[PDB]
């Protein structure tokens, strides 16, 4: 059992998805080193079976300003999957904000 | 050009909980320097009110980005112009106190 503070991962990205920043604490939730996700597109990481809804997600934000996403899975460092749910708000556009929350544990 | 940014979290009053470490490149503080003071203490005078005014206002905008441009003193005592852009967010699971996200970036008063 973890507390809400250690659940939680804020991201930013350029208007393509690309990460530019990530908190450090992905690392102990999904294995990856925020390093080596930077100029890595977000779509690289979604399951193949929630692309097609995140590209939906990913036109509503940019329409809109703001969306939450549905639930989805991030493939994990280490293989696996998690499921997350987040909030993304464009910063006028100059970059995505993205408040990320795990919704599992790493399910392979 | 990259502008230069940094994201922070505040809690309702406007103290840093969370400082992303670009703030070195945007306003020349290591983390630590910036971490459990208040905004309010790095913003011009004339423009304090104003900053606590929107971080007072950012939490009653269901969740909507609120901006605000400011003078911001740098590690060198300079000020400098930046515009934070807000927003409150909450673990929709939880009861827990709205916090608030920034993007803080440096821009020009032109
Ligand atoms: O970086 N995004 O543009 C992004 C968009 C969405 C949404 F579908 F809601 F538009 C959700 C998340 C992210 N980025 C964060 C992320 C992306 C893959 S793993 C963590």
């Known amino acids: 059992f973890k507390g809400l503070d250690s659940k939680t991962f804020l991201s930013e990205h350029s208007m393509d998805m690309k990460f530019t920043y990530c908190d450090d604490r992905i690392t102990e939730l999904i294995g990856y080193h925020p390093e080596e996700l930077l100029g890595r597109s977000a779509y690289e990481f979604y399951h193949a079976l929630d692309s097609e809804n995140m590209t939906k997600s990913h036109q509503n934000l940019c329409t809109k300003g703001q969306v939450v996403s549905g639930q989805y899975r991030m493939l994990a460092k280490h293989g696996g999957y998690v499921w997350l749910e987040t909030q993304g708000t464009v910063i006028y556009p100059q970059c995505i904000m993205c408040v990320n929350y795990v919704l599992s544990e790493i399910e392979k | ?110």
Not at chain 2, 82 to 104: A, G, K, L, V, W
Request: with cysteine; glycine share 4%; hydrophobic share 35%.
């Open chain 2, 1 to 110: 050009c990259q502008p230069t940014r940094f994201i922070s979290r505040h809690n309702i009053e406007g103290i840093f909980t969370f400082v992303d470490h670009r703030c070195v490149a945007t306003v020349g503080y290591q983390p630590q320097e910036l971490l459990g003071k208040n905004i309010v203490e790095f913003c011009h005078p004339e423009d304090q009110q104003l900053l606590r005014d929107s971080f007072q206002q950012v939490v009653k905008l269901k969740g909507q980005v609120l901006s605000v441009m400011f003078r911001f003193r740098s590690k060198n005592q300079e000020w400098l112009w930046m515009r934070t852009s807000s927003f409150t967010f909450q673990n929709p699971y939880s009861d827990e106190i709205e916090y608030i996200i920034c993007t803080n970036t440096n821009v020009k008063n032109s």
